[PDB]
Amino acid sequence: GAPIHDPDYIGGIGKELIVDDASDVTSFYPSAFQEHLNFIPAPTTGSGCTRIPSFDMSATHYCYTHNVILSGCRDHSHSHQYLALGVLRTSATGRVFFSTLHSINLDDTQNRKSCSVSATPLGCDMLCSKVTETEEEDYNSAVPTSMVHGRLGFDGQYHEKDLDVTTLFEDWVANYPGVGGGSFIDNRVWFPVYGGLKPNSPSDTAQEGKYVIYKRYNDTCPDEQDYQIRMAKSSYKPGRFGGKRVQQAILSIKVSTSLGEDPVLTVPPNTVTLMGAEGRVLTVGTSHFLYQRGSSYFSPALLYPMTVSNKTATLHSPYTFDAFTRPGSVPCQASARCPNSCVTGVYTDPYPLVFYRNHTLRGVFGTMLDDKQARLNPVSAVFDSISRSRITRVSSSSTKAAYTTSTCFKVVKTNKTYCLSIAEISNTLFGEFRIVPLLVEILKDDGVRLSQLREGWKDDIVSPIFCDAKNQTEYRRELESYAASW
Amino acid sequence: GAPIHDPDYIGGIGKELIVDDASDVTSFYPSAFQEHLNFIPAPTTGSGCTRIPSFDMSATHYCYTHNVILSGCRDHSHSHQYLALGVLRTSATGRVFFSTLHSINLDDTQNRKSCSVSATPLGCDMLCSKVTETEEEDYNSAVPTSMVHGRLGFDGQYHEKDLDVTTLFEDWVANYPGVGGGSFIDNRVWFPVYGGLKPNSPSDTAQEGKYVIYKRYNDTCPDEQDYQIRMAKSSYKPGRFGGKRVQQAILSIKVSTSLGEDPVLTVPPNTVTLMGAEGRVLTVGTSHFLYQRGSSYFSPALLYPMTVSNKTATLHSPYTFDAFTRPGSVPCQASARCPNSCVTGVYTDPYPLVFYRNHTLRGVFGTMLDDKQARLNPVSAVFDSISRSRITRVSSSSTKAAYTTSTCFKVVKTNKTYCLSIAEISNTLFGEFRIVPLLVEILKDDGVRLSQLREGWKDDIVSPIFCDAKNQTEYRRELESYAASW
Amino acid sequence: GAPIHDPDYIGGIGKELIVDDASDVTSFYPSAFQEHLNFIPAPTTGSGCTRIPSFDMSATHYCYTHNVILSGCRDHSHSHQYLALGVLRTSATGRVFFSTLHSINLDDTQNRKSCSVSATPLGCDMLCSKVTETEEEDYNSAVPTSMVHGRLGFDGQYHEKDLDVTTLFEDWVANYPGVGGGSFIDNRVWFPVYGGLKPNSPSDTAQEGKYVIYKRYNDTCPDEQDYQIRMAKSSYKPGRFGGKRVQQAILSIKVSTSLGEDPVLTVPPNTVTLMGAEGRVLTVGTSHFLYQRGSSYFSPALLYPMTVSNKTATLHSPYTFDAFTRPGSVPCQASARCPNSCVTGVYTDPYPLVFYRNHTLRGVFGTMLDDKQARLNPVSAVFDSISRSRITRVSSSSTKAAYTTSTCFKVVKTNKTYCLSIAEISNTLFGEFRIVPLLVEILKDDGVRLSQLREGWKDDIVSPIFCDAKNQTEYRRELESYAASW
Amino acid sequence: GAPIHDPDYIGGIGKELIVDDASDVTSFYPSAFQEHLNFIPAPTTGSGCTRIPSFDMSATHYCYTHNVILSGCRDHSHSHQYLALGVLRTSATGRVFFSTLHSINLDDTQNRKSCSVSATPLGCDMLCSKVTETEEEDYNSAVPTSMVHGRLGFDGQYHEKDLDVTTLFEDWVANYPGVGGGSFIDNRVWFPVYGGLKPNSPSDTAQEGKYVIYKRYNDTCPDEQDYQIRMAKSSYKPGRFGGKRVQQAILSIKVSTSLGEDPVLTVPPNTVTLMGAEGRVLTVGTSHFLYQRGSSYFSPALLYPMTVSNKTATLHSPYTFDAFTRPGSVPCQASARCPNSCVTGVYTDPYPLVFYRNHTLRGVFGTMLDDKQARLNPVSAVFDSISRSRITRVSSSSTKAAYTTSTCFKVVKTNKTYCLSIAEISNTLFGEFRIVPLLVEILKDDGVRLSQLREGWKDDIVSPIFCDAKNQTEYRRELESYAASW
Ligand SMILES: *[C@@H]1O[C@H](CO)[C@@H](O[C@@H]2O[C@H](CO)[C@@H](O)[C@H](O)[C@H]2NC(C)=O)[C@H](O)[C@H]1NC(C)=O
Ligand SMILES: *[C@@H]1O[C@H](CO)[C@@H](O[C@@H]2O[C@H](CO)[C@@H](O)[C@H](O)[C@H]2NC(C)=O)[C@H](O)[C@H]1NC(C)=O
Ligand SMILES: *[C@@H]1O[C@H](CO)[C@@H](O[C@@H]2O[C@H](CO)[C@@H](O)[C@H](O)[C@H]2NC(C)=O)[C@H](O)[C@H]1NC(C)=O
Ligand SMILES: *[C@@H]1O[C@H](CO)[C@@H](O)[C@H](O)[C@H]1NC(C)=O
């Protein structure tokens, strides 16, 4: 009944990709991006933008979707959504390309933002928040954000249902999906979530006093012991929301012919998770991961080994990768070693790649925006706990960068490992944001930087190409203004 | 068996959308660009470009293709092709989109150039040239170009046959399809083709001494009578090709389960056609038309009415639209009123729109490159024999552009006529070129721009935004250089 | 669109040839072999052989094919395939002969083995397995063998679709087409198929306990009931295949403009079929058949009456012909009356010839290899359930032979029933097997051998002619080695 | 209207294939035999043989025919004639293989013997004699042999016209075409013909006293001058014909829509040509040849330079190749250096292969029967004036053989020169003779007989394979008795 995949993929899809205990994680590096076919539509109107891609790689199919903001790129503006389910396919020449069996376009009045999608046996499942108001008004709204549920089936038809926000979220002021891909666990699909908590509610006094700190590396926070505790605490209550607690949430909805059956929220204790934020839930073989965005003071990409028992989820000590960082505010940037209360950053997810014999994780792959402050210079690299492998530049100079979601799959019949980072980059004319399906293969560092590098750089015309701007580097300044987030 | 269309589109597809004798031509007009899902793939590759698009609209379905060069944008260079078939559907809100049902992506060792495609009952029929050598090299090859005739089934599987060139094209040095595709007439499909002839052959001796001169409205050439003839003659033997005679053609193949069954080559007298160049065969109502790109002296768009009998065709003097002009090299430019030997211009196709009570053609639609010299500033307006209506600018400033293909259909249920224009635009990052399906509706001028006019301009970052360059206007020099062509 | 046949043949093909309840079956006999123009190519290489023919006769055309080993005659080795489609034609003198209208010779890199063909409304459909490995290697290969469905269209062109085995054959370790061809029925083509099953697979569990014993006429096995059952049961798991069950299978594809569309795999109960082997799917008048080779304990020829309902055929207790035998290894040879586990014999099909008044089958014709043990002495003859007619020998003495596939038809104009056997015969120089189409007319014994009898024997030089060898009759020993096989 | 060929050959048919004044003639040698698809029919009847192949290759098509005896191999026996025309094609992988485009098999009461065939502009033009009587009975028949003009057209049908022999042949007792085909020149065809002459008739009294002595090589003839002159003369009155003069003659008919129009008989002087016999007419490029069979005392092959003026041909002093010999009766064998009155030999023709800059012949190709006395050991080799290159053996040991006609062509695209030898070889079962399309590629001797030889030999089973015969070499006797001719 399900589309499944092509002959060559089955067996290498959604499983531990690389296990070697003799080799080093950094010995694995990405090749130059490979030519394939685009399943991601391109902007027609030169007015509004399109951003926020979501991807989940099933053993069977794949699910992807993004949001289209009709006019202006502003968060709250009236928006559409394009969801697409598909299947890997290999051409007559045996080249790799993603294929879309069924897509959908929602043009209606109702709004959807931070739609996350996961792959489940029944179809494409996505959890969207319905926004009739803006960010500020919603935190001012004691009524949980109207949330819904939908499934794109292999039949192509789309059926939706509106979950009960009041009951589920009664302790929540605002509720949004973690924007990232979820995954299918024990016959119920799980999505990450984040949001603010009502003052003095059952769930708020629950995380009260709870906090945690994770250091970066060799260099350690120069602040005193009792000083590290304070900043870590108030982080959960940023000024943006005026002393509201943003908690990390995890939603578990059973996958059944009945849409939205037995919704169950699972909140990890704050002695584990940092300030609530958007992210992605991953399952590699028997392993389960919850990816948290760097919205907090901590730059290095985080993967929380997670488990599920009795409809509820457990979170353990997060996997950190130091070379893999993200841009953010002044208090919280790629170089920040201390705790603080701030709002900045961006979504870039590592997808588990390299593993040990005991099956524990060691190093991964990611498409990172390489920079300290503004969101810039997309770069693809393979990571371990400490540093990252040789990289591949999306373009020379620096180019406008945004949310990136990476996924790695294996081709059994060719015995070759592939990774697809779905990325947002400056679209210039046509609305400033065009998401691209980049394709790459992991290689082995053993051999004879052969003097021919197509991964060295790539050509961006938006900075260069007539006038050389002006070289006193208010350009850096004008660039850092050129970067728009949230 | 066939997909047909939505119940909405049936009845308004491929016909005369507007017939009024009491309406002035320029009094209709395009809308601002409408929002729709893009059915056209975007470059993954950060190396080569994506060029030479083609389109046809069947009473049932649509057929489209575009060629992808793997290294650089050069004409001869090795390239994959991408073809697809799709339908016209209406979403839940009644919105207008074009869905691709089945697409094929050609990765093989065969290098296909200038591919013409038509929508046919049995599927998508495509005429392509496989090219072993470069342009000059093949005009040095007394051997006619090698070609193919394929069809993409509704079943998704794509078949191809190599048609016999040595027999059929025998008098030709080189033979190329006309890009934008011919159409389905009388249980056989007809494609546009141009190319070089074997000097003093059967055909070369046929078009010898034959010519025709086409003047411009209200503007007459100051040159002497004999002179004009002397030129116009030499128009068919341009310098680039060395005394050889460049000829126009249309190819008729009988649509059948077998591919390429019974090829018949229709060669018109030059007493009618200008220097052979690329084009399109269009069918609207009972009306057949053949577009010729303006690749020699005559700028105004040319629609040659066409009759069909005995597997061959016959041409009659073209419908001249003096409102519709293309850029070109200095000798033949949007302005030029005299005959001149030259090779320049671009493919911009007029689509028949308004007709009289006697069934003759009145006005047409299209996107034109607005400029005298090079390819720049695409625009979409309505035209009659002389002037042109209020336009819709695809960009403010001026940006690099290319071939554009316009097509107009009617939505019967809502009784709303729409126009699709597929244009190529400088893509900067990702290979300099991208093929966009622009959307436009036909509206009535009668009324009161409201002092809003969002259709006026569209932003472009290519040229401006860090520097503005050097107003010294050597800018226009490099902007002219930013144009890439054949 | 069809080529059909010559008007003299029309009405005699694919029907019941003889109905007399009054005449004795064995009163009908083959003439002496007839002179006709041979449509089956003969070897060029003085190295590899050419073996394994398959033939099916449409009411319009015919379809024949054979594999060719490029070097050596060994099964696994690289093999071309020649497929032809042709027609019955009558010369000026009315002399019957077979004509090839179009042909395709597949020399490519894909290995096609055990190829079956069938005459269908669209052309020549055929079903081949492509083999990467030796049979040995593939019964260990948990993966089912790749198969392809090609068709040669009257247009002369040839197209392939490799059907997707992982899903269709999923319960099979290896899978092969039944050599001798299938027939076109109910707007879908049906093929003979065999292979091994995965232990404890849905199919395997389905056949567990299932078996049948077929007994020889007038000769009954002395072995006690228990024993026979045990032996019989073992027949399905010969030790050559290592205790995997060897299963007979029928394959149906719906013949359509799309090759290999909507396959359905019909696995009969072993409560009926014997051990899996090659075969032929026959259609005679309103009746249908499945020929099964004698590859296990049961010597006589087998036709299974086959009813077709719901794309899945059904089978019934088989017609047997007790004097139509096949050579076999000691446990299972011409004379074998008991059940035993073995793999032997040769493909020689009966073609239903004579019928009763109720349309049931009464007797058949065909070419049998006449000897108890090895492959030797081809003889053509008419058979009934019990014994056989006056015969005709392809040669005096005893010649190495192989598969035979016979087909009988009637020329109504003259009212003369004829029969074609395509036979595998030793070729001496040129590769040891030459596939030849012998031709014969059927006759009523009522009449007067006139003391002429040119049908008695034919001269073979491969045994005699400079020496006569050594009468010690170790000749027999060597002669039995002159036979090669599978 | 002709079929032409596949585009890859054009320009490689009927021209000087090899011109190097630097290379040694014997440095060009044949390949091992090549795998291809056999276009010549294979025997069905196990009684009568199939003999006497003729061939001519025009740049458009080819023409081949052969005779089929019904019972026994005896010349005069009633026999069918097969004629077919075809077109060189290359496969998917570019393999050379011939194809029969059209064929007719003549079963009528007429007998066509010693049939020659020439590919012309209008089709396959063949010339046969219709034989009522035996060879004896005919040369005692004062009346000239009835002959005929057939043609096989592209439309597929075949017409025939009997030319007036009484008027044309008046001076002859008997007349037959030269077997191997002649070729078309200047809007009229030319055939090889030999036969007898009425005593004291104009043609006979002309050739009286005219004779030619051709000396082999460094081995000369010791007999004195008168003894030689006298035998050289006797050479034209062999006993077989009883003092009737055997003459060589060339037949020229006009090639038109009306068969038999304007026949002309050119008879060259005996001061040039040896005793008359079967032969071939070869137009290679700008030159013309005639191959006289070795039917007389001259062992080496013979190519007479042949010029044409006034519809009547003319010959010149012949090209001798001493290496390329033929077997015959005792007085005239491979080794005969002197003149003699005898009748033997066989048709094995040289095909012009290597040339000089002045367009004079240097060496040829051919398949020769290598032996002094009887017809045995087919071998392919490249010859020059004196010696021969490395050779290809159609088999090991000594296999019964017969006429060989051969022609060489080039494949332009791949630029490779091939050669086709059509040759008669012992068939054992199924008729004692089989005509086979033997294929080869010519090679450069430059290189290193690499220690891997498949051309070394080939395997025949008719001498060997049980009993080793008996070694006293009455075997050579029984062998030389296993060869039958004429
Ligand atoms: C699986 O094996 C790996 C390799 O030994 C373990 O990795 C070590 O973990 C310890 C404990 O944290 C560290 O002190 C070492 O630095 C790690 N070594 C390396 C090379 O990474 C890992 O702990 C094991 N996993 C489990 C669950 O036992
Ligand atoms: C169809 O109607 C149109 C519009 O009246 C005709 O076009 C006119 O043709 C006449 C005669 O050649 C010209 O004098 C006018 O200048 C044309 N008018 C325009 C606006 O182009 C056309 O002739 C009619 N078709 C036929 C075949 O009679
Ligand atoms: C079809 O006809 C055949 C021949 O008449 C029938 O076969 C006979 O069946 C009867 C009844 O069992 C037996 O007594 C005879 O021995 C059979 N004859 C032969 C030659 O086998 C057959 O029964 C008929 N089919 C049906 C369904 O009745
Ligand atoms: C097969 O036949 C049965 C009985 O008519 C019918 O119910 C069923 O629908 C058929 N199967 C298919 C797939 O059409």
Author numbering:
A (entry chain D), B (entry chain C), C (entry chain A), D (entry chain B): 124 to 571, 578 to 615
Question: Can you quote the paper on this entry?
Answer:
HN protein binds to the receptor (sialic acid) for virus attachment to cells and plays additional roles in the virus life cycle including F activation, and receptor-destroying (neuraminidase) activity to facilitate virus budding. HNs are type II membrane proteins, with N-terminal transmembrane domains followed by a stalk region and a large C-terminal globular head domain. Proteolytic cleavage of the C-terminal extension in HN0 removes 42 residues, leading to increases in neuraminidase and hemadsorption activities that are necessary for the viral life cycle.
To understand better how the Ulster HN C-terminal extension down-regulates HN activities and may reduce virus pathogenicity, we determined the crystal structure of the NDV Ulster HN “head” or “NA” domain precursor. The extra C-terminal residues adopt a mostly extended conformation beginning near the bottom of the β-propeller structure, traversing the NA dimer interface, rising above the NA domain and inserting C-terminal residues in the HN catalytic site. Second, an active site variable loop (the D198 loop) shifts into an inactive conformation, further inhibiting NA binding and catalytic activities. In the Ulster HN structure, we observe that residues E584-K587 in the C-terminal extension directly engage the second sialic acid binding site, indicating that this would be sterically blocked in HN0.
